[PDB]
Tab-separated table of C-alpha atoms and ligand atoms in Angstrom:
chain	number	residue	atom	x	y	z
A	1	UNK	CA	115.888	94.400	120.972
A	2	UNK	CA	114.897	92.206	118.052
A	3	UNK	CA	116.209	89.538	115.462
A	4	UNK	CA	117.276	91.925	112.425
A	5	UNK	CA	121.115	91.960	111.811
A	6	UNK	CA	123.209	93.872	108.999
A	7	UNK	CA	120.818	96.804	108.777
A	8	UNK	CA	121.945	100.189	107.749
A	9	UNK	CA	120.093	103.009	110.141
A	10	UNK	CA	118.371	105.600	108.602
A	11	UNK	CA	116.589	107.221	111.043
A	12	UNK	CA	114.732	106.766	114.336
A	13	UNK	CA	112.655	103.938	113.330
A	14	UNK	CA	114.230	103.118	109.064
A	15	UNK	CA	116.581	100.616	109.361
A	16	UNK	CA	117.773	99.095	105.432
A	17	UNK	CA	119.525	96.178	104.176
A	18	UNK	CA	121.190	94.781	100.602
A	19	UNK	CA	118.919	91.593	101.076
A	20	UNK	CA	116.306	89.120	99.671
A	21	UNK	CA	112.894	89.447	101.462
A	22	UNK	CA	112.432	85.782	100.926
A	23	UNK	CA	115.303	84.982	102.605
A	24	UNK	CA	115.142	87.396	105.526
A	25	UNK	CA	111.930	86.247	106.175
A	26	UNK	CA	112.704	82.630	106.239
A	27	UNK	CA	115.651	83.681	108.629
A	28	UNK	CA	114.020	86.231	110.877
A	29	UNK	CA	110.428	84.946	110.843
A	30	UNK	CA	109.283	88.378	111.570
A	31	UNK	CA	105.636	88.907	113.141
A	32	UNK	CA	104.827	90.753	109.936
A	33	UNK	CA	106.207	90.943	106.388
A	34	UNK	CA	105.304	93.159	103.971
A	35	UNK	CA	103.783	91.848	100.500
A	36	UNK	CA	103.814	94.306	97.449
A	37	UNK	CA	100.607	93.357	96.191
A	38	UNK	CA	97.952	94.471	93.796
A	39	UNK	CA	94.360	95.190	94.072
A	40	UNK	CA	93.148	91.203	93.204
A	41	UNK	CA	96.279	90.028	95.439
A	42	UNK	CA	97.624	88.231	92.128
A	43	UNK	CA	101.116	87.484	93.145
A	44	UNK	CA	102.276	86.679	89.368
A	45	UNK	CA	105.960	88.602	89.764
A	46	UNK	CA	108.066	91.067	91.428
A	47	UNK	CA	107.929	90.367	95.151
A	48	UNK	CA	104.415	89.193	95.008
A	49	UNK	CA	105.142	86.385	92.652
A	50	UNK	CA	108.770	85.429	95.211
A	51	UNK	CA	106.771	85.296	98.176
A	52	UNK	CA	104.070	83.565	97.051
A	53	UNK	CA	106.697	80.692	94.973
A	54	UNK	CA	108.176	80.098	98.404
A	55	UNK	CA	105.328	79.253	100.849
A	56	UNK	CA	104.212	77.065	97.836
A	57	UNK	CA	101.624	78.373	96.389
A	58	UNK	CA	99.799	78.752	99.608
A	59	UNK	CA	99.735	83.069	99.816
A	60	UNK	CA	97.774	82.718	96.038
A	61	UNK	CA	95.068	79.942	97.566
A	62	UNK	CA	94.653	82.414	100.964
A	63	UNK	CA	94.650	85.198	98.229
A	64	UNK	CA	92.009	83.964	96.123
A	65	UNK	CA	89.625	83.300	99.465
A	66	UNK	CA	89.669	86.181	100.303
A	67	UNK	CA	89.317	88.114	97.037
A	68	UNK	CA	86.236	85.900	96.517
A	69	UNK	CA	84.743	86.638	99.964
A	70	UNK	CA	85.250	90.783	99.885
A	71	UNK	CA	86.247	91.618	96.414
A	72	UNK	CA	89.297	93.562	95.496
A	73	UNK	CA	91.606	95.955	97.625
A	74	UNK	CA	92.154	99.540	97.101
A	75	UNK	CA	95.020	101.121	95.940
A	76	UNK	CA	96.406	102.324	98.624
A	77	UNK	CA	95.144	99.600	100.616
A	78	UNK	CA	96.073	96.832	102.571
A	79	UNK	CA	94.944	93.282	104.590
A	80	UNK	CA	96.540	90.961	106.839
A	81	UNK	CA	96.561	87.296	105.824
A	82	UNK	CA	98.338	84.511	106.734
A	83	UNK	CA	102.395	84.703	106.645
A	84	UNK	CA	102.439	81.009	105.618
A	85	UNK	CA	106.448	79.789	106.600
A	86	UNK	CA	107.639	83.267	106.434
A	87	UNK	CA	106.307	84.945	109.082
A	88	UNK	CA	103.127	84.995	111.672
A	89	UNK	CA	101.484	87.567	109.404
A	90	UNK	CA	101.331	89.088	105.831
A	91	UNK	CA	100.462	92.675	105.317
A	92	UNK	CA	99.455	92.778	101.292
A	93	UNK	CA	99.623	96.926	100.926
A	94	UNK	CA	98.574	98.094	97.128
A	95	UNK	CA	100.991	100.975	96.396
A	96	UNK	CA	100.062	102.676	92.680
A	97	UNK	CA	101.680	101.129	89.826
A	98	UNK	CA	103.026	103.714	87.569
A	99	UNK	CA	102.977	101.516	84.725
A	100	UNK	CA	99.253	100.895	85.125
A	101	UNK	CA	99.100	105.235	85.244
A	102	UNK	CA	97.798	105.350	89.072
A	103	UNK	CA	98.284	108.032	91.171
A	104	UNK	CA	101.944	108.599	92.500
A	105	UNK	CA	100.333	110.770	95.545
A	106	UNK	CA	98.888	107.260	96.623
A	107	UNK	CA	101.918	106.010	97.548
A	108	UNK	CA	102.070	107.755	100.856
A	109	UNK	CA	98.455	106.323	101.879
A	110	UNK	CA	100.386	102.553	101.219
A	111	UNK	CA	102.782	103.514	103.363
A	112	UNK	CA	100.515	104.809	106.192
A	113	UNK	CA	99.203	100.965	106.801
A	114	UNK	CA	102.422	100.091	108.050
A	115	UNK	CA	101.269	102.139	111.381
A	116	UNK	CA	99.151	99.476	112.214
A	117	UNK	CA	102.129	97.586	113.148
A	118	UNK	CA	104.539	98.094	115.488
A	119	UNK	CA	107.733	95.911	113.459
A	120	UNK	CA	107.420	95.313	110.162
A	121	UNK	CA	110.154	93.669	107.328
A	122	UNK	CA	108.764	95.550	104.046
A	123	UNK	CA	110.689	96.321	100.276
A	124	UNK	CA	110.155	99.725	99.201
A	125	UNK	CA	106.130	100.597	98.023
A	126	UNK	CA	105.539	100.722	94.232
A	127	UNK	CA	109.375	100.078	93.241
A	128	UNK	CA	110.585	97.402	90.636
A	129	UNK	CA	107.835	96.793	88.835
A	130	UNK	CA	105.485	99.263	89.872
A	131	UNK	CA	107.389	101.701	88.168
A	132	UNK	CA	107.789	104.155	90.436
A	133	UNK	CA	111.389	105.769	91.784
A	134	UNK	CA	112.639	103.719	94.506
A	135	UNK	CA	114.396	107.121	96.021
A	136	UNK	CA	111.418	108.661	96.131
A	137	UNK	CA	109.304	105.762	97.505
A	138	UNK	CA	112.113	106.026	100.317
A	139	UNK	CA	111.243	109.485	100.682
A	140	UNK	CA	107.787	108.794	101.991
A	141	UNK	CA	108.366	106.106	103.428
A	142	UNK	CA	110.913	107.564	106.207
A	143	UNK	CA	108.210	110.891	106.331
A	144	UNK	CA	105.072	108.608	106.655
A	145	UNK	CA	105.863	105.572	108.832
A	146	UNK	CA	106.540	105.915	111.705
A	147	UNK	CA	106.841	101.943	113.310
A	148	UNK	CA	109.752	100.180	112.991
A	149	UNK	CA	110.329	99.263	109.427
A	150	UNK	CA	113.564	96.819	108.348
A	151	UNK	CA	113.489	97.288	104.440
A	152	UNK	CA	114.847	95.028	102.386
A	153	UNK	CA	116.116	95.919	98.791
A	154	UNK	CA	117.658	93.027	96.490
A	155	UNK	CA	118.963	94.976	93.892
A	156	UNK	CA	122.308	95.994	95.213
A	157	UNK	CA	123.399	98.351	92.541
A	158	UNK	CA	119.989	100.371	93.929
A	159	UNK	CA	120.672	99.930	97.702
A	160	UNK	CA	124.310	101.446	96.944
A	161	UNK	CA	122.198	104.396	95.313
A	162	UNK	CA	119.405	104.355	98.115
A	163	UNK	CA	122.015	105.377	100.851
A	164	UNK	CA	124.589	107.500	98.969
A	165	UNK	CA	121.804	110.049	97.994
A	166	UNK	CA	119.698	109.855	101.427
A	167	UNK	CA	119.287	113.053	102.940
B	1	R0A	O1	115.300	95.465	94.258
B	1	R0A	C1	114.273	95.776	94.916
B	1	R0A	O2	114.171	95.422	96.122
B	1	R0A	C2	113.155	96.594	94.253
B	1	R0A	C3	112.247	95.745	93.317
B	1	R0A	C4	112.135	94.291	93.755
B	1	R0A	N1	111.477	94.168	95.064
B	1	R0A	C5	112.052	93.245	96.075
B	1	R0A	N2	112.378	93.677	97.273
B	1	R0A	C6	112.904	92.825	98.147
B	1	R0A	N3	113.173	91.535	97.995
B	1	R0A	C7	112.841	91.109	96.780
B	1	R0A	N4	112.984	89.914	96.346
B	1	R0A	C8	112.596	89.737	95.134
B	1	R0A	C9	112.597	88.616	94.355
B	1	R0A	C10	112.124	88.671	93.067
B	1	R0A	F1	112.128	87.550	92.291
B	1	R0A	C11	111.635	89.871	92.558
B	1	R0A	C12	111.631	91.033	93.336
B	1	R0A	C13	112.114	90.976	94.646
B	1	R0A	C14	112.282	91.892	95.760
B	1	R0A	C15	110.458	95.211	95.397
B	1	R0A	C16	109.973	95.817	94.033
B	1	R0A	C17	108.621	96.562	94.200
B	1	R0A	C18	107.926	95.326	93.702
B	1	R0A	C19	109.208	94.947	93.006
B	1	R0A	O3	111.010	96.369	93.291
C-alpha cells in the first residue's frame, strides 16, 4: 500500500492521473519524482522549468553542480539528485526531443531508468514540449517499465485522450 489516490489503473504496475506533478509531489512526497530534463539539466520550461520554480530555484543550483563536475547527460539518460521539498529524490531522465530532431527509438532507453526504482511519480517521457506523441510515449512506457509508475498528466483534454484510446 502507498500514498497515491485518484489514479486510473492501467496495468499491473501503470497507474495515471488528470494532475499537476508539482502538486502531487508536494502532497505525496514520493521517494522519487520524475524530472523531464535535458542533457545540461536546464530546467527553463515544460516540467523542468515547474519543478525547478517550486523548490526555488534550488533543482537549477544542484543542476548546475553537477553539470560542472561530470559534464552533460545522455539522451536517454538519467541521474538522481536531490528532490528538494518535493520528494526524497529526483530522477532527471533525458527522453529525445523531437523538436531538437533526436531519435524517437530513444525514448524507450528513458524509460528503462525508471527500473532502477521500485515507485516512481513520473509525466509521460518526451511529451509537451519534447514534441513527441504522448500516446505513443504511453506505449513504451507501459511495455518498458516495469516498477510502479503513478503518471501524472496536466493537460486534461490529453488524459481524456490517453485512456479512451489505451489498448
Ligand atoms: O500535459 C502534460 O502532462 C504533458 C506536457 C506537460 N508535462 C507535465 N506533466 C505533468 N505535470 C506537469 N506540470 C506542468 C507544469 C507546467 F508549467 C508545464 C508542464 C507541466 C507538466 C510533461 C510534458 C513533457 C515535458 C512537458 O508535456
Amino acid at each position: 500500500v502507498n500514498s497515491f489516490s485518484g489514479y486510473l489503473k492501467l496495468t499491473d504496475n501503470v497507474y495515471i492521473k488528470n494532475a499537476d506533478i508539482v502538486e502531487e509531489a508536494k502532497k505525496v512526497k514520493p521517494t522519487v519524482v520524475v524530472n523531464a530534463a535535458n542533457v545540461y539539466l536546464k530546467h527553463g520550461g515544460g516540467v523542468a522549468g515547474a519543478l525547478n520554480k517550486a523548490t526555488n530555484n534550488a533543482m537549477q543550483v544542484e543542476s548546475d553542480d553537477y553539470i560542472a563536475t561530470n559534464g552533460p547527460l545522455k539522451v536517454g539518460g538519467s541521474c538522481v539528485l536531490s528532490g528538494h521539498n518535493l520528494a526524497k529524490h529526483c530522477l532527471h531522465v533525458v527522453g529525445p526531443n523531437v523538436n531538437k530532431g533526436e531519435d524517437i527509438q530513444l525514448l524507450k532507453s528513458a524509460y528503462e531508468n525508471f527500473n532502477q526504482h521500485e515507485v516512481l511519480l513520473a509525466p509521460l517521457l518526451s511529451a509537451g514540449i519534447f514534441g513527441a506523441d504522448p500516446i505513443h510515449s504511453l506505449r513504451v512506457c507501459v511495455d518498458t517499465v516495469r516498477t510502479n509508475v503513478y503518471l501524472a498528466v496536466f493537460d486534461k483534454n490529453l488524459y481524456d485522450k490517453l485512456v479512451s484510446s489505451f489498448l
